[PDB]
Amino acid sequence: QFLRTDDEVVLQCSATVLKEQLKLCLAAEGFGNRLCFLEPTSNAQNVPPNLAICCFTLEQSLSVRALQEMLAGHRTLLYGHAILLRHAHSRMYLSCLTTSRKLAFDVGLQEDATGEACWWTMHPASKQRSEGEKVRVGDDLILVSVSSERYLHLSTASGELQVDASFMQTLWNMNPICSCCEEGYVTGGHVLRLFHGDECLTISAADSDDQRRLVYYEGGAVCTHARSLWRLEPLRISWSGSHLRWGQPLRIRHVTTGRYLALTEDQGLVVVDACKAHTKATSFCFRVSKEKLKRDVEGMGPPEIKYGESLCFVQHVASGLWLTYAALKKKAILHQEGHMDDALFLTRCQQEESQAARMIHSTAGLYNQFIKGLDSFSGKPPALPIEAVILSLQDLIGYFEPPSEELQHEEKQSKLRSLRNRQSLFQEEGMLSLVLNCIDRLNVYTTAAHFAEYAGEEAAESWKEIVNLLYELLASLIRGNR
């Protein structure tokens, strides 16, 4: 009922697009794009809303007297406090930038929580709440950027909906996503692996004849590759990050591919594009048993499903079909009766791995777009994402860059081991081919001006930069780091 620090929230506002009141959350991508945007949560039944990129962690809520004192646990948020919001998807911080794209600033992300620019003071939106009172869940509120002293505010100019820091006010809901959970219990929004018996649930490797659409039970090294990672996403906006319960409908999202576990009329059990991932075809639940078989709480809920200790049957909700094998690599199928040994156990994946999986997804998406733009004009003299591609390239280069040679051996090796594991994950997801395709397609052009003939000078102004960054990323992915 009250928001404590280390709680997870989405900042939600309202707008009336196409003459109807749509609610939508504050979103940021992170790498490749620092600028914030808005994610519609409204059309949940037909399209899975991208809540993952909307979650922020309430890192700290301080009195201005302690906030000014800093620049030299489980506290409840009080009105008047300045808060620090950590973007969960990127581990970056919600900040008020010094760019503008009409007196206003851009709202986005800071790589590090530095200075006043990443702090926002909370203020009551009504005579019901007062300065010093605890901020209550589902309260409308006003947020003021400490550095600029402007309001976090949604724009409607001209056609599209944006976010900026303006002298205009916007009323913002803090929807709780999650709070303290019971140790070792599965909660929504968790990225995990579903094990069988070793064998785990996965899609095929990159570039497979599959088009990566089919689901498998596979053993060996997959259990340590990103392709076997899934996010459990319940059919809720608020307390989506609550404990999961037996029978609770949920979507199962494949992380790197972005597609959703689904039952199809034609294909059968497959993974499916986000836009085509409707509730009926996409809703699964965890069952204690296969026997015949309530109303969701406004909180973390009762802890029901335990990591590694709970054997779970997976069931498609609409059809009642069981996730089973077909009969080391087996096709996963949905079946009426299934197999006596269909029960999976869930192992929570760790952060370094989960982050890398999500980073793969963004980068694949951004670069596939960049390639599509290149392919669009091959032989023809569709705006290319130059700005983002450059930033993405730069970001991954720093991500992969080896430790400073003048560092202690104990830490150097440990930081080196992770770098290697981080590189491996990307490598096994065909990130090298991705970088190579971008290089090969850019190399079809001899001079920067030759590229300008098919793309224009503005785009060509960064041609030698993108190739140098791509070759640099390539090298950084390849480097042994032993």
Distance between CA 110 and CA 59 in Å, rounded?
A: 14
**Ranges assigned E (strand) in 16-135:** 22-30, 33-40, 56-62, 82-87, 92-96, 105-110, 120-124
Does one domain contain both 257 and 322?
Answer: yes
Please say whether the dihedral angle defined by the alpha carbons of residues 470, 471, 473 and 478, taken in this order, is positive or negative: positive
Does one domain contain both 3 and 106?
Answer: yes
Q: Considering 161, 179, 197, which residue would you say is the last residue of a domain?
A: 179
Distance between CA 11 and CA 3 in Å, rounded?
A: 13
Question: How many domains are contained in the chain?
Answer: 3
Whether omega for the bond prior to residue 155 falls within 30 degrees of 0, making it cis, is no
Lookup: tokens for 451: 């590229």
Does one domain contain both 390 and 327?
Answer: no
Does one domain contain both 343 and 407?
Answer: no
Q: Which domain holds residue 219?
A: 180-349
Lookup: tokens for 374: 């290149």
Q: Could you tell me the resolution of this structure in angstroms?
A: 3.0
Q: What are phi and psi of 70, to 5 degrees?
A: -70, -45
CATH number at residue 227: 2.80.10.50
Does one domain contain both 84 and 187?
Answer: no
User: How many Å separate Cα 290 from the centre of its chain?
Assistant: 33
Distance between CA 351 and CA 357 in Å, rounded?
A: 10
Does one domain contain both 153 and 191?
Answer: no
Query: Among 163, 141, 146, 173, which residue's Cα sits nearest to residue 56?
Result: 173
User: Which run of H or of E encompasses 216?
Assistant: strand 215-218
Distance between CA 465 and CA 306 in Å, rounded?
A: 49
List CB contacts of 213: < 8 A, sequence separation 6 or more. 203, 259, 267, 270, 271, 272
Q: Considering 179, 204, 237, which residue would you say is the last residue of a domain?
A: 179
Please say whether the dihedral angle defined by the alpha carbons of residues 159, 161, 162 and 167, taken in this order, is positive or negative: positive
Does one domain contain both 81 and 214?
Answer: no
Query: Among 136, 106, 135, 109, which residue's Cα sits nearest to residue 122?
Result: 135
User: Which run of H or of E encompasses 441?
Assistant: helix 431-443
Distance between CA 121 and CA 94 in Å, rounded?
A: 12
Give the number of other Cβ atoms within 10 Å of residue 180's Cβ: 10
Q: Considering 349, 374, 408, which residue would you say is the last residue of a domain?
A: 349
Does one domain contain both 286 and 312?
Answer: yes
